[PDB]
Amino acid sequence: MPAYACQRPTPLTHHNTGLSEALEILAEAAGFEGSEGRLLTFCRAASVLKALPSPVTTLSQLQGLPHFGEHSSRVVQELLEHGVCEEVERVRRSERYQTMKLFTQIFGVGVKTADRWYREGLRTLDDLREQPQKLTQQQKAGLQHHQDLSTPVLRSDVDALQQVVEEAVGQALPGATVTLTGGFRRGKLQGHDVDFLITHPKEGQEAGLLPRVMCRLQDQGLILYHQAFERSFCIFRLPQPGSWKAVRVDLVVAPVSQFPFALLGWTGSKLFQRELRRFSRKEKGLWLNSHGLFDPEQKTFFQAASEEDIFRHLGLEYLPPEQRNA
DNA sequence: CGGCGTACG
DNA sequence: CGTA
DNA sequence: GCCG
Numbered sequence: 001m002p003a004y005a006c007q008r009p010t011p012l013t014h015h016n017t018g019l020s021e022a023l024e025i026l027a028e029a030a031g032f033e034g035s036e037g038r039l040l041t042f043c044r045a046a047s048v049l050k051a052l053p054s055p056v057t058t059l060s061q062l063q064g065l066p067h068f069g070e071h072s073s074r075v076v077q078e079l080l081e082h083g084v085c086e087e088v089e090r091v092r093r094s095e096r097y098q099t100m101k102l103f104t105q106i107f108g109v110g111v112k113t114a115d116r117w118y119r120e121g122l123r124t125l126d127d128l129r130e131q132p133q134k135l136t137q138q139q140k141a142g143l144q145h146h147q148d149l150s151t152p153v154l155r156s157d158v159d160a161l162q163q164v165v166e167e168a169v170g171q172a173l174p175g176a177t178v179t180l181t182g183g184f185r186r187g188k189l190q191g192h193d194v195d196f197l198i199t200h201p202k203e204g205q206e207a208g209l210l211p212r213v214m215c216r217l218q219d220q221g222l223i224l225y226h227q228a229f230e231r232s233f234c235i236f237r238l239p240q241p242g243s244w245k246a247v248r249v250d251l252v253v254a255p256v257s258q259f260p261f262a263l264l265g266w267t268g269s270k271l272f273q274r275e276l277r278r279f280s281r282k283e284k285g286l287w288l289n290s291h292g293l294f295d296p297e298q299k300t301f302f303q304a305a306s307e308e309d310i311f312r313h314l315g316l317e318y319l320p321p322e323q324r325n326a
Numbered sequence: 327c328g329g330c331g332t333a334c335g
Numbered sequence: 336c337g338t339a
Numbered sequence: 340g341c342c343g
């Protein structure tokens with residue numbers, strides 16, 4: 001088992017679901033406390049279990065697995081022995097965890113804002129609605145739409161949204177294309193949002209595109225919330241039988257020269273990309289982002305025509321999106 | 327011990 | 336600060 | 340919290 005998540009296939013569904021879920025509770029709680037290092041180790045240990053070919057049934061099967069030391073092994077041991085880990089259950093029922101989860105789930109609220117509100121004594125969404133002076137426009141929208149945004153986006157919803165975006169994109173710039181990215185491209189059947197990547201086959205024609213797209217979607221009455229730009233984090237009005245629901249949609253524009261890097265970056269998973277960028281820098285001495293891959297010795301950028309090119313550049317076996325579910 | 331992804335709005 |  |  002290699003040490004980086006980008007070195008091994010990780011399927012969406014696997015054989016250690018309960019164990020990985022428990023470790024990811026501890027990772028999430030670490031993040032709520034600002035402990036980024038412990039968050040990473042618990043995320044990585046969870047991801048290792050996702051990549052295994054069969055269930056862990058005995059503690060000895062953790063020997064030699066990367067990112068399993070005393071703490072993560074004890075968590076697994078307790079789950080195997082008793083079906084529950086006391087530390088995990090204590091986190092789950094704690095007021096701190098439940099409120100930080102509730103607050104950081106709001107669009108426009110991160111850990112730092114959630115934590116300040118927690119320390120001020122705030123605990124519920126209605127607590128926030130009662131003091132709207134303390135809210136940004138973005139947070140106001142996130143709170144108004146919170147119930148709809150808490151409902152999973154279905155793969156069956158994605159196709160309708162993509163046609164709508166393609167219509168506006170085609171008027172904004174004929175020939176521009178729309179590619180589904182994010183979790184749905186990795187095979188997920190549900191999501192928290194829909195992520196789209198937009199480009200044009202003629203380098204440079206994509207300049208200034210996203211304002212033109214957003215103006216057209218807004219004119220069609222489809223935009224419940226949005227903020228020159230190349231990323232847009234929106235709330236869309238999605239038709240439903242006899243009504244509609246609010247859905248988060250992310251739009252990103254990239255020039256075609258950067259499209260493989262942007263596709264790779266925006267297809268995720270989040271942990272897969274962090275691990276990939278960590279691997280690139282630490283093992284290969286190359287700097288990776290959603291725009292390119294930089295050699296800081298030669299001061300040159302790698303040209304890539306595909307995701308396959310990028311994996312080859314980095315000396316990694318290619319993983320299709322369905323195996324990037326780290 | 328230092329390191330832990332990397333951008334844009 | 337938020338967001339991907 | 341774990342790796343190197």
Ligand SMILES: Nc1ncnc2c1ncn2[C@@H]1O[C@H](COP(=O)(O)NP(=O)(O)OP(=O)(O)O)[C@@H](O)[C@H]1O
Nearest residue numbers: 182183191192193195265266267268269270273339
């Ligand atoms: N913090 C991050 N660091 C690096 N890449 C990230 C980060 N957040 C998001 N991304 C990239 O943006 C993609 C879309 O982000 P999302 O926040 O939309 N997560 P996604 O994988 O789509 O699952 P859902 O919760 O939406 O169902 C991710 O899959 C990553 O490729």
Ligand SMILES: [Cl-]
Nearest residue numbers: 255257258291
């Ligand atoms: Cl470029």
Ligand SMILES: [Cl-]
Nearest residue numbers: 260305306307
């Ligand atoms: Cl590609």
Ligand SMILES: [Cl-]
Nearest residue numbers: 289290291333
């Ligand atoms: Cl980036």
Ligand SMILES: [Mg+2]
Nearest residue numbers: 182183193195
């Ligand atoms: Mg998504």
Ligand SMILES: [Mg+2]
Nearest residue numbers: 193194195250
């Ligand atoms: Mg998104």
Ligand code: NA
Nearest residue numbers: 104106107109
């Ligand atoms: Na949030």
